[PDB]
Write a protein that binds this ligand. Structure first.
Ligand SMILES: Nc1nc2c(ncn2[C@@H]2O[C@H](COP(=O)(O)OP(=O)(O)OP(=O)(O)O)[C@@H](O)[C@H]2O)c(=O)[nH]1
Ligand SMILES: Nc1nc2c(ncn2[C@@H]2O[C@H](COP(=O)(O)OP(=O)(O)OP(=O)(O)O)[C@@H](O)[C@H]2O)c(=O)[nH]1
Ligand SMILES: C[S@@+](CC[C@H](N)C(=O)[O-])C[C@H]1O[C@@H](n2cnc3c(N)ncnc32)[C@H](O)[C@@H]1O
Lengths: 343, 98, 49, 53, 269, 107, 161, 98, 49, 49, 49, 54
């Protein structure tokens, strides 16, 4: 699941990767349940890695569903309720107005819930872009992005191995710290767990502190070395990357359809829509495993003698030694001439 | 005192063995080196139960040590203990200087 | 919470919506049957129970 | 001014003379112990509305 | 034998046993004076007078607050709603606090439960000389539906049962536009007759307007030009020779300005 | 009890210490111009901080008397001036007009 | 505050010993200019854990005619109110507070005042001989005429404005 | 017991035991007067009516008022014993004097 | 041991073993780089009584 | 779109319900119990008690 | 007896309980065919008339 | 010394001494509850304010 999610970034406009339905709590969940609290933690760390246009809203409404009976938010119509399943928000028209505008959530009524919303709006990861290929010789098969750009759903910085594991400047480390702190605030006063006869506040606190200060190198990897590997692999793929823009929370720019046209521009014919337009998402959905993604984010590691230059030279040699770009180019020639001859 | 020779720490230790080459260390290298130091200091002194394991499950490059509790109204009390010297680290630095 | 797709359909056909007049006429006829029997009424109440 | 509730500004005063201490002797102990009508070792405090001890 | 209640304590919707009032009037008033001081100290502790001296307070919250404090029903949820902002109704429609003993929104139609204009003592025993209370002495005799527009209210009462008659006021209602819907309780302290409180409210207001007509002086202002109700919707359920219909006719007459040939006393019996 | 409760409620409130005096532990310091003479009668524990002053004069509290009814007042005027609309806005802020007074008797 | 004749009172918070700010001073000056040398009574007392004083007085069309003259509202000196370190219990406001009725001397003075006001026209230069510390004539004649008056005892009205 | 929230229990114990005979205003509708007594294990959950002896009406809940007074005034007081000798040994305590 | 001072009841006790990001000083790292410790234990009221 | 009921309905505020006495059925039971309480009178209703 | 004795489960949340319980009975579309039956009933009545 | 220790410095009762208050509480002031180390200090403080005016 981790590697497939990491690889589906290159195919945003064809396949959209959503978190599995089974990963959500059972029957909506509840904050009075330790199992559902750990469900929420395992789920909130895997969402930022999926190329789903509405991951933030699912992350918000998971806790909004768990929080029923103890906190409330304003609704939109007289049809839906705060306790509707968060996994049913798969299209931009379902985003709550109180989520798109923070100040509709009163802090005197939804303290934890507004804190979670504010965290989502401030510390959710930021998309970025990296250069790859050689557009001056190999051309470039990008359609909706500029000729040499590889969009990424996360930020990336230059690569060095000598950087602190507990660096809260990294977006993924910061996200983990924020989620652990919010769950800590949730469990502090026992305002939401009436029924725990014993006092599990200290135990919850200690385990959340461990999860926070775990010694993982996966966030550092994703920030620094993953984009380099993607950009090294991209120009050699048989089916080159096909992407659609990553909009963070700007709802009105979220892509919702991808069609193909075969008719001219100054004619009116049958509205024979393409066959890819009949998807609820932008592409063929595929579900991932939140548990696997979370455990992979928590437990990473490098070899204790990693030398970056040696490692990546030794890895780049045998895969460029087996390249087929120079045949794919001639194939593209023949395809273009075939299309024009058919017309 | 030893980890600051191969890495970047926040303790003001002098450095003599900089003319010797060394890799750009990371978390794995630091943890490995610390484990070797621990095993050596067990083998000498003849110990068999957990000399330095509490500190090794973190990042040894920035190891500090302190404790605190917090009253209900947010007030906080901490105990940052003084760091007494170590004749073994003094002798190690002397041997490096020689 | 039920879910529905969001994309261009293929023009299904599922005739179900009817008028309040038809609902009321069916209810009147059904009461014309069921009233005075109670041997088809008590099983209904036990099922709901 | 005022700290949290207003205090008299514009002026400032305090006592000036202090009486000298008096040692406590056995005669004083006995006189206090046989509480007479004029000087008992106690003093009644009473409520400000019902005016009762 | 009884007591009439005003602005602060006018939200006593709960049952009479929850409050545990004393028996005699003097003991009652001493009890309530000593308890309202505690309530005042709490309200002042949360709202300083110097910073909050000249700003509107929500009347619904105020009445509900005294009512919840007198019955020990966790009044704290009412405290952060005491100061109004941008409307005295939309604030309660937009609030998300869990308080349904006192009111509950219906999508632009606030529903509050009216309570206890009057109050009964021990020595009140249904006497021919005791003052009539018009069923406004027990917990739930009607419900009030407040909104912003009578169009919205009228559309609300399409999918709501209005068979006990719904009463409007049209002149200068208490806290904005609203309809009244009486429950099916009954007044007993008038032995030959028993009225179901939707006739009781109408009879009370009707007699009050007849009283006000006789005492007009052309130079003495009144707090309201008419007191009658004018039943609005449920008339299809009450036709000829019914007390509700006759009281509607009498209230229309009193509003237009008629007068009773018999003098009505100053304290009814 | 009620007076003590009111005083404690005033003391634990919001605001700041508007005086030059801040408590130490070594010794209770006395201002350079405080009328107290206790340091002249005590051998240990007192210090006169020369470099902190209190500009207020020295005199006991002089309290007037109370009366159960309001008393007439006669205003007196000065030189400074302000805008009439400003004064009207300020009186509108401070007013309490919406109340029904006892009418009285014309004749 | 809409009727040309009626009562009017204000409440300002004075905590203990202090020099009242510019705002409260301007408010009291505005109330004085609105009242126009009618009787003014004050009360000081603690209300809801705060110490506040109120100033009660009535207005009148003569008061309005006086207020129509001044360009800038004068400012009282707050000493007589700042010195008050006492407690003056309130009382319910009454429109016609005088229960014994005016006296014959007052009635004769009011006859004289009405005669003066009826005699004086608009835009006429006048001069009264021995007006008093309170220039009552300022409330009688119209607000668009110079009113230079003389008296052996020094006045108590503003200067300028 | 060493539980810091020991006093709020044995007050809410009797408050639970007498429901329908006397009432007190609680904070909200979750930790009501009928909630268990063991569930009040945090400083955040002590009732306002327990931290203020005034909200327990003396003629509405007289026995609860008396029990609150008794808890506040006659609950046992802590003290200390001064063990040890720091001359030969040191002093391993952190948040108390040696 | 605080008797009934709700303000002084303790809430956490945590140990730190490393600085956080760049802050060199333990007095500034300790507030956000600690792990909480403590375990509850149950007793028998009837045995104690 | 309306369903009549022979008793008063009132929505709930919490999802973790806990007992309380304030409802018309408990008030009815209290009224009945109080009537029999002041009905039990060995003089004039039960001589042999 | 049903009025005098009644207890909820020891630790229940009504949102979860009803979300579990109500779900099976809202996956059976036996209610959409009764509408077609009403259509046919009214059609038959009018055709006879 | 965590409940605060109080000295007097002027003319103590029976010679030099410190005072250390226990953790008992005063209840006859309903809105507030003071732990007697504030109570002793409040009493003496109000007594000195009284003495200043007279
Ligand atoms: N709980 C709720 N009670 C309302 C609010 N204010 C008024 N009451 C009720 O509001 C209802 C409608 O009041 P009105 O339409 O003004 O008629 P009314 O003749 O003034 O009613 P009374 O004042 O009781 O004589 C009454 O039945 C009152 O008991 C209160 O602030 N909150
Ligand atoms: N048992 C012990 N009580 C002391 C002795 N004399 C005074 N008391 C206590 O000594 C303490 C300190 O007294 P001071 O330092 O003089 O303060 P204080 O204001 O005089 O105390 P009070 O006299 O109680 O108002 C007080 O709390 C007294 O109750 C007594 O002779 N033996
Ligand atoms: C009590 S007042 C009444 C004034 C009255 N309000 C009026 O102007 O019609 C009488 C005034 O007459 C003035 N008048 C009397 N003898 C004075 C003269 N010697 N010098 C100028 N003032 C004369 C006095 O100054 C005094 O103030």
């Amino acid at each position: 699941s981790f590697r497939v999610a990491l690889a589906g970034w290159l195919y945003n406009g064809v396949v959209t990767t959503v978190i599995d339905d089974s990963s959500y709590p059972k029957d909506g969940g509840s904050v009075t349940s330790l199992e559902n609290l750990w469900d929420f933690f395992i789920l909130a760390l895997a969402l930022p890695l999926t190329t789903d246009p509405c991951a933030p809203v699912k992350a918000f409404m998971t806790l909004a569903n768990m929080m029923v009976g103890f906190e409330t938010i304003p609704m939109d119509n007289q049809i839906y309720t705060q306790s509707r399943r968060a996994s049913a928000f798969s299209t931009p028209h379902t985003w709550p107005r109180c989520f798109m505008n923070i100040q509709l959530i009163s802090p005197i009524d939804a303290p934890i819930l507004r804190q979670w919303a504010e965290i989502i709006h401030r510390y959710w990861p930021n998309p970025s872009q990296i250069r790859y290929g050689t557009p001056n010789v190999f051309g470039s098969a990008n359609l909706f992005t500029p000729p040499e750009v590889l969009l990424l759903p996360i930020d990336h910085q230059p690569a060095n191995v000598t950087t602190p594991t507990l660096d809260f400047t990294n977006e993924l480390t910061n996200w983990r710290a924020r989620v652990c702190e919010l769950m800590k605030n949730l469990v502090d006063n026992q305002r939401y767990q009436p029924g725990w006869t014993q006092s599990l506040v200290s135990s919850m606190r200690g385990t959340l502190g461990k999860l926070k200060l775990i010694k993982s190198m996966t966030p550092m990897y994703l920030q620094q070395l993953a984009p380099v590997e993607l950009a090294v692999i991209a120009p050699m793929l048989p089916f080159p990357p096909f992407q659609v823009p990553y909009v963070r929370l700007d709802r009105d720019r979220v892509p919702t359809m991808v069609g193909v046209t075969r008719q001219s521009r100054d004619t009116i014919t049958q509205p024979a829509l393409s066959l890819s337009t009949t998807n609820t998402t932008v592409g063929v959905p595929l579900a991932l495993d939140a548990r696997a993604i979370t455990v992979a984010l928590l437990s990473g590691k490098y070899p204790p003698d990693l030398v970056t230059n040696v490692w990546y030279a030794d890895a780049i040699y045998p895969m460029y030694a087996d390249t087929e770009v120079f045949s794919n180019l001639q194939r593209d020639v023949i395809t273009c001439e075939a299309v024009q001859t058919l017309v | 005192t030893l980890v600051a020779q191969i890495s970047e720490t926040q303790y003001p230790v002098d450095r003599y063995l900089d003319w010797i080459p060394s890799l750009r260390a990371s978390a794995a290298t630091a943890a490995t080196f610390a484990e070797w130091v621990n095993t050596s200091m067990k083998t000498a002194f003849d110990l068999s139960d957990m000399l330095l394991e509490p500190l090794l499950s973190g990042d040894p490059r920035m190891t500090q040590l302190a404790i605190q509790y917090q009253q209900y109204n947010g007030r906080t009390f901490n105990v940052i203990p003084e760091m007494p010297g170590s004749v073994i680290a003094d002798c190690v630095q002397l041997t490096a200087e020689v | 919470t039920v879910t529905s797709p969001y994309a261009p359909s293929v023009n299904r056909l599922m005739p179900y919506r009817i008028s309040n007049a038809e609902r009321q006429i069916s209810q009147i006829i059904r009461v014309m049957n069921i009233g005075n029997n109670a041997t088809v009424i008590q099983p209904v109440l036990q099922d709901i129970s | 001014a005022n700290v949290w509730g207003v205090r008299l500004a514009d002026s400032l005063s305090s006592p000036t003379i202090e009486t000298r201490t008096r040692h406590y002797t056995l005669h004083d102990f006995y006189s206090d112990l046989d509480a007479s009508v004029g000087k008992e070792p106690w003093r009644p405090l009473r409520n400000q509305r019902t005016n009762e001890i | 034998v009884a007591v009439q209640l005003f602005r602060p304590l006018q939200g006593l919707v709960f049952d009479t046993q929850l409050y545990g009032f004393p028996g005699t009037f003097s003991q009652w008033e001493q009890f309530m004076k000593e308890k309202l001081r505690v309530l005042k100290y709490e309200v002042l502790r949360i709202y300083p007078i110097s910073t909050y001296n000249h700003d509107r307070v929500n009347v619904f919250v105020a009445n509900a607050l005294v009512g919840a404090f007198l019955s020990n029903q966790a009044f704290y949820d009412l405290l952060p709603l005491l100061i109004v902002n941008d409307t005295m109704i939309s604030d309660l429609l937009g609030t998300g606090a869990a308080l349904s003993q006192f009111f509950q929104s219906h999508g632009e139609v606030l529903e509050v439960a009216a309570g206890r204009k009057y109050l009964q003592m021990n020595n009140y025993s249904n006497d021919d000389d005791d003052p009539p209370l018009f069923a406004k002495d027990l917990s739930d005799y009607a419900k009030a539906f407040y909104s912003d527009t009578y169009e919205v209210l009228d559309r609300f009462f399409w999918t709501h049962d209005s068979s006990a008659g719904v009463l409007v006021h049209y002149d200068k209602p208490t806290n904005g536009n609203h309809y009244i819907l009486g429950t099916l309780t009954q007044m007993v302290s008038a032995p030959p007759h028993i009225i179901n409180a939707t006739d009781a409210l109408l009879l009370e207001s009707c007699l009050e307007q007849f009283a006000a007509n006789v005492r007009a002086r052309s130079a003495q202002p009144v707090t309201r030009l008419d007191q009658c109700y004018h039943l609005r919707w449920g008339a299809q359920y009450v036709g000829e020779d019914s007390l509700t219909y006759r009281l509607g006719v009498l209230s229309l007459l009193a509003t237009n300005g008629y007068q009773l040939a018999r003098p009505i006393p100053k304290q009814l019996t | 009890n009620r007076w003590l409760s009111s005083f404690v409620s005033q003391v634990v409130s919001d605001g700041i210490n508007e005086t030059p005096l801040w408590p130490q532990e070594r010794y209770v310091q006395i201002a350079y111009d405080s009328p107290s003479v206790v340091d002249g009668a005590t051998q240990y524990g007192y210090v006169r901080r020369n470099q902190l002053r209190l500009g207020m004069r020295i005199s006991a509290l002089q309290s007037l008397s109370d009366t159960p009814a309001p008393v007439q007042w006669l205003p007196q005027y000065t030189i400074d001036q302000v805008a009439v609309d400003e004064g009207d806005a300020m009186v509108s802020q401070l007013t309490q007009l919406p109340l029904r007074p006892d009418y009285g008797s014309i004749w | 505050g809409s009727s040309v004749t009626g009562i009017e009172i204000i409440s300002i918070e004075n905590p203990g010993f202090s020099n009242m700010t510019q705002a409260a001073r301007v408010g009291i000056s505005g109330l004085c200019a609105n009242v126009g040398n009618a009787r003014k009574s004050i009360a000081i007392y603690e209300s809801h854990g705060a110490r506040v004083l109120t100033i009660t007085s009535r207005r009148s069309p003569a008061s309005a005619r006086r207020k129509a003259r001044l360009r800038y509202l004068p400012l009282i000196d707050p000493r007589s109110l700042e010195v008050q370190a006492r407690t003056i219990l309130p009382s319910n406001p009454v429109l016609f507070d005088n229960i014994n009725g005016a006296s014959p001397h007052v009635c004769l003075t009011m006859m004289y005042n009405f005669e003066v006001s009826s005699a004086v026209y608009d835009g006429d230069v006048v001069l009264d001989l021995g007006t008093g510390p309170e220039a009552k004539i300022l409330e009688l004649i119209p607000s668009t005429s110079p009113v230079t008056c003389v008296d052996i005892r020094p006045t108590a009205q503003p200067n300028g404005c």
